[PDB]
Design a protein around this nucleic acid. Structure first.
Ligand SMILES: [K+]
Ligand SMILES: [K+]
Ligand SMILES: [Mg+2]
Ligand SMILES: [Mg+2]
Ligand SMILES: [Mg+2]
Ligand SMILES: [Mg+2]
Ligand SMILES: [Mg+2]
Ligand SMILES: [Mg+2]
Ligand SMILES: [Mg+2]
Ligand SMILES: [Mg+2]
Ligand SMILES: [Mg+2]
Ligand SMILES: [Mg+2]
Ligand SMILES: [Mg+2]
Ligand SMILES: [Mg+2]
Ligand SMILES: [Mg+2]
Ligand SMILES: [Mg+2]
Ligand SMILES: [Mg+2]
Ligand SMILES: [Mg+2]
Ligand SMILES: [Mg+2]
Ligand SMILES: [Mg+2]
Ligand SMILES: [Mg+2]
Ligand SMILES: [Mg+2]
Ligand SMILES: [Mg+2]
Ligand SMILES: [Mg+2]
Ligand SMILES: [Mg+2]
Ligand SMILES: [Mg+2]
Ligand SMILES: [Mg+2]
Ligand SMILES: [Mg+2]
Ligand SMILES: [Mg+2]
Ligand SMILES: [Mg+2]
Ligand SMILES: [Zn+2]
Lengths: 46, 98, 201, 183, 307
RNA sequence: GUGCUGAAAGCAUAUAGGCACGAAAUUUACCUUAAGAUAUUUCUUAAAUAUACGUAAGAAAAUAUUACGUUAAUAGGCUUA
RNA sequence: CAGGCUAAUUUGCGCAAGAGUGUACAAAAUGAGUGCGCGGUUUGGCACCUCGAUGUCGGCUUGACUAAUCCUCAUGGAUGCAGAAACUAUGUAGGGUACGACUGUUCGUCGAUUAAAAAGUUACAUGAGCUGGGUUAAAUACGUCGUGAGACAGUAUGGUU
RNA sequence: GUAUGUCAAAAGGGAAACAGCCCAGAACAAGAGUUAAGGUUCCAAAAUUAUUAUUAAGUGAAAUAAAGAAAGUUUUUAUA
């Protein structure tokens, strides 16, 4: 995982999802990729 | 700096209502003086200059009523409530394109 | 949604019983949204769910079909629960008639599995416990949830059975949590054909 | 001066009012249509109305120095209405002048330790004048979680119908018609 | 607020009106939630009041020397049971020793009069887990209430030390001795920072003051010996206080309760040693009304000189 | 950080909705002081009770705290171990 | 001198972009010259302000707080994660981070232990709490500069806190 | 330096507190009197006043942190 301020898709399998958003926080934007786990990225700091 | 002059960057809906009514009040003074003379077939150079290069409150854009041109601002615009004695001074026209 | 429009073919034996709009009083909330109790009974068992009221079911008993529809496609909440409520009914119908199954494969030298009874930790009389020898120092035993049938045709093959897919697939993830597949040798617990790409060396 | 000369006994009496935090309030709700969307009075909008009653600012004889406030019984405070995500994101802070002894608690956790009545009192407290009558006035706010309370006999009545009951308005008008039959 | 997050007037009693049977969430605070989050730790059985008599060693066969403290039981009776429907928690009130009737006040003389117990020296409550821990009033507890090897906790008031300094009270290091120090050897030094730290001494600052004479609990102390005739319960290790001071002994909270057989045998021994603890209590309660009614009317002199 | 179900968006998705795993941090638990509701089939009609004084102490700068005062082992003396 | 304004500079950092290195392959790691920024620690600028100072700071006593983490706990990435060790990053500041030698001092340097022997703010945090290593003198000798009286961010010994 | 004003030597209202800003120049009283700046849910005098949209982040609500990122969402212009 890499926490960038500018997350981008690096292949055709990379998906942009917002996870960890619940009634207590807003969550982060994630780049999830099942093909290459090196494309895992996050946007924002806890 | 350290001296706090707490001036917000934008005006409230209550200040805007009075800025609109102050521009519309200066139009009645120029419309009363311009019609009072026309009945006598007379004219003034300052009354003809105003009507030529100055718009009415109904012809101004919202950004020309609540903002002025400041070359030191990022987008060359500044709140009109930042001008000295802005409540008793006329300011309707800004440089073209800005 | 394109899935909520598809009618739901009710196979022979499956019986759907739609309730009436009701509201359970909640002292914590000033207004609860009405729901509808839907029962789907059949040969293997009975499942129930409470759907929002805005979802309308056209239960055709003549042709044994039931199509869903929402009162407003413009609302994001109604578009979402439309496709979701349809996906659950599809599982409920195909879970009470045929049933849901999950196959787990144990890869790795020394990985076994047996279905034995542990009367000490029985949560309900006759509970089955899956005992896994996953190269641990301690034994791993997990009681099958009430409603599921677990069997081991082979030492390295578990077979879970149940009418509730969410319950069957959620219990298979608990077994897989002990040994997640690795990318170097393929050792771990694979659930329903799951595969892992290996490395060159 | 004649307007004030007379018996002001009943103008200074303490009236026991009642409001439910769950009943939709058409006047204190921001959603005014449709009829089914009318919500109850929010926490801060229910607190601003209560603070007005605690101060007696609803009477024609109000004086900030004279303690002419009334009682307010608030029921069903467990179903206190809030908007957005305040319940799980609003924080209440507290300090005892010792560095490091800062206490934080969210509305949902403060509603578990001391119920929803504590969240209402903290709101009505900040809406009262900060003076020596503050704790007297705030003490007249009797907030409960359910429908039960010990003041079911103190609630103001008109002809046997508690105000806020189904048919209290008709009982009030039936007594004013009998009053006008005199000089 | 005054204490915690609550702004409720202290004179208001709203507890009975917020009931879980009406559909309200079970509060996280209150006597109910306090007992639920202490169920495991709470001791199953009551404790005993004992008097610290001294320290010694327990020499064991084959070579074991175990330092131990001797605690004596001096007429330990059960005086009152605190139920949850009446007090809000489960506990047993235990008495120790005796006191002269003249020194016991009338409020307390009529308290023991309604029970059939001679006035005690001290009284203490021991919290029990549930209603199974309440014992008959007026039964004596002997050292056999415990068994050898049972770990217990001993609560006693520590030795008084008067006004202590910074070294003895808080373990302060002090300052130098001869390298130019000026009248500041055992003093506490700095008491704070400067204007950036609040221009004040910070609450909780460690300073000289009184030390000792407070309750201290020693946990997990085995029972090495139990002698009924002597009346002593020898525990391992040290115990807080001086010789002749009363201490409270109970099962350890951080250790599992004694086996079910033991908790029942000890309860079965009170029904044998005291076969009629209720008949003697009901008779004392029946007499208290007669005397309490004679005091009210003013005819108490007649009963005193009746026989 | 890692999952199950699962749509908006026929796919995908631990994104909405419905469940879950998860840290020397947080909360509880543990210990101490404070708080003083409550309890007793408790006492009191000018008292109950407390104080003062005297012998003291498990207490101790003052104060306070905990006992005792002849129907008494509180302190000293004496006697024995 | 400290506080105040600024942030050129810094032994303070982050983000964006990616020439290049990585046998292959930008983003495992690495990151030229730059851009957009935060922050108030170093060296500075200013001068609202006369006051405890030129090493502005050291040691002792006693802390409180911060988190940009040395140790302990959870964890993602790593054709460059087989294991072990180590690297990079994300959570997390509960408790620890010792002892001695030589250096006027902190700068530092080394010795041997240790799970580790990390940092910063608080008027050198703290001299109406201690020290005087310092903060200033008059004595004396030497060195350098000056015609001379003298001067020196010099050197050494001594010097009412 | 220059232009204009205020303070200095100017009280009062607004800017949470405020020499210099926004209003307005205090001889003393009375008045739900008429207004400026500014405001009108409560503290706190006056709208929980009407109309049309956006925001779901308590963003924001009287002192704009930037470049940038992204199936957040709305509208417009094209478009299958
Ligand atoms: K000395
Ligand atoms: K994650
Ligand atoms: Mg300032
Ligand atoms: Mg005020
Ligand atoms: Mg003593
Ligand atoms: Mg020493
Ligand atoms: Mg202060
Ligand atoms: Mg002070
Ligand atoms: Mg799906
Ligand atoms: Mg999936
Ligand atoms: Mg009584
Ligand atoms: Mg008396
Ligand atoms: Mg004394
Ligand atoms: Mg004697
Ligand atoms: Mg290359
Ligand atoms: Mg780290
Ligand atoms: Mg990995
Ligand atoms: Mg490894
Ligand atoms: Mg802790
Ligand atoms: Mg220092
Ligand atoms: Mg000082
Ligand atoms: Mg000289
Ligand atoms: Mg010379
Ligand atoms: Mg000398
Ligand atoms: Mg002057
Ligand atoms: Mg002025
Ligand atoms: Mg204001
Ligand atoms: Mg008026
Ligand atoms: Mg008002
Ligand atoms: Mg905000
Ligand atoms: Zn990818």
């Amino acid at each position: 995982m890499k926490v960038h301020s500018a997350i981008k898709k690096r292949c055709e399998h990379c998906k942009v999802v917002r996870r960890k958003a619940n009634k207590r926080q807003n969550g982060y934007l994630y780049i999830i990729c099942p093909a290459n786990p090196r494309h895992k990225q996050r946007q924002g700091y806890r | 700096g350290g001296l706090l002059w707490k001036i917000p960057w934008r005006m409230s809906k209550f200040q805007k209502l009075r800025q609109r009514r102050r521009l519309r009040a200066v139009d009645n003074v120029v419309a009363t003086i311009e019609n009072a003379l026309a009945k006598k077939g007379e004219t003034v150079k300052a009354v003809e200059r105003w009507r030529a290069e100055m718009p009415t409150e109904a012809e101004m854009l919202p950004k020309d009523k609540y903002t002025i041109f400041d070359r030191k601002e990022k987008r060359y615009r500044k709140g009109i409530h930042k001008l000295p004695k802005w409540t008793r001074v006329s300011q309707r026209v800004n440089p073209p394109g800005y | 949604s394109k899935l909520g429009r598809t009618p739901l073919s009710i196979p022979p034996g499956v019986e759907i019983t739609i309730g009436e709009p009701f509201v359970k009083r909640d002292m914590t909330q000033w207004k609860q949204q009405p729901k509808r109790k839907i029962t789907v009974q059949g040969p293997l068992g009975q499942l129930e769910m409470d759907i929002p009221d805005f979802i309308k079911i056209d239960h055709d008993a003549e042709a044994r079909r039931a199509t869903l529809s929402v009162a407003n496609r413009d609302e994001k909440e109604q578009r979402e629960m439309w496709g979701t409520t349809w996906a659950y009914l599809n599982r409920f119908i195909m879970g009470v008639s045929e049933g849901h199954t999950a196959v787990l494969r144990l890869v790795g030298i020394g990985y076994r599995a047996t279905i034995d009874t542990r009367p000490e930790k029985e949560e309900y009389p006759g509970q089955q416990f899956v005992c896994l020898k996953l190269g641990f120092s301690h034994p791993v035993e997990m009681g099958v949830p009430k409603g599921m049938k677990a069997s081991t045709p082979q030492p390295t093959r578990i077979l879970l059975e149940g009418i509730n897919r969410e319950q069957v697939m959620t219990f298979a993830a608990d077994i897989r949590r002990w040994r997640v597949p690795e990318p170097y040798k393929g050792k771990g617990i694979f659930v329903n054909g799951e595969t892992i790409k290996l490395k060159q060396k | 001066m004649s307007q004030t000369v007379g018996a002001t006994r009943l103008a200074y009496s303490r009236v026991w009012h009642h409001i439910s935090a769950v009943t939709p309030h058409p006047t204190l709700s921001t959603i005014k249509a449709p009829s089914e969307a009318i919500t109850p009075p929010s926490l801060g909008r229910l607190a601003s109305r209560i603070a007005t009653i605690l101060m007696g600012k609803h009477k024609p004889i109000w004086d900030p120095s004279t303690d002419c406030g009334d009682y307010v019984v608030v029921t069903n405070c467990a179903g206190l209405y809030t908007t957005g995500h305040k319940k799980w994101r609003k924080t209440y802070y507290r300090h005892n002048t010792r560095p490091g002894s800062l206490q934080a608690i969210t509305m949902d956790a403060l509603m578990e330790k001391h119920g929803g009545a504590e969240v209402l009192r903290k709101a009505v407290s900040g809406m009262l004048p900060k003076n020596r009558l503050r704790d007297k006035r705030l003490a007249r706010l009797k907030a409960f979680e359910g429908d039960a309370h010990p003041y079911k006999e103190n609630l103001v009545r008109f002809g046997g119908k508690v105000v806020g009951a189904p048919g209290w308005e008709e009982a009030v008008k039936a007594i004013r018609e009998a009053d006008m039959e005199r000089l | 607020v005054k204490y915690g997050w609550s702004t409720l007037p202290k004179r208001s009693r709203p507890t009975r009106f917020n009931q879980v049977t009406q559909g309200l969430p079970a509060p996280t605070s209150g006597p109910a939630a306090a007992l639920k989050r202490r169920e495991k730790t709470t001791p199953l059985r009551t404790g005993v009041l004992a008097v610290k008599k001294g320290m010694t060693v327990f020499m064991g066969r084959t070579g074991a020397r175990i330092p131990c403290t001797v605690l004596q039981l001096d007429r330990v009776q059960v005086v009152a049971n605190k139920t949850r429907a009446k007090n809000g928690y489960w506990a047993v009130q235990v008495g120790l020793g005796e006191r002269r009737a003249e020194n016991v006040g009338a409020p307390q003389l009529g308290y023991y009069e309604a029970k059939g117990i001679p006035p005690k020296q001290t009284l203490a409550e021991f919290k029990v887990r549930n209603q199974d821990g309440l014992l008959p009033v007026g039964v004596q507890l002997f050292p056999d209430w415990f068994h050898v090897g049972q770990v217990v906790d001993v609560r006693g008031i520590t030795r008084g030390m008067g006004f202590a300094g910074g070294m003895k009270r808080h373990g302060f290091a002090g300052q130098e001795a001869s390298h130019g120090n000026s009248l500041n050897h055992r003093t506490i030094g700095s008491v704070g920072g400067s204007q950036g730290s609040g221009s004040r001494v910070l609450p909780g600052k460690k300073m000289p003051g009184r030390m000792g004479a407070q309750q201290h609990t020693v946990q997990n102390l085995p029972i090495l010996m139990v002698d009924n005739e002597l009346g002593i319960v020898v525990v391992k290790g040290a115990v807080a206080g001086h010789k002749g001071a009363v201490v409270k002994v109970q099962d350890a909270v951080k250790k599992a309760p004694p086996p079910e057989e033991f908790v029942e045998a000890t309860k079965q021994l009170l029904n044998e040693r005291f076969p009629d603890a209720e008949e003697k209590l009901q008779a004392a309660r029946k007499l208290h009304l007669e005397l309490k009614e004679a005091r009210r009317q003013g005819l108490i002199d007649s009963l005193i000189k009746n026989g």
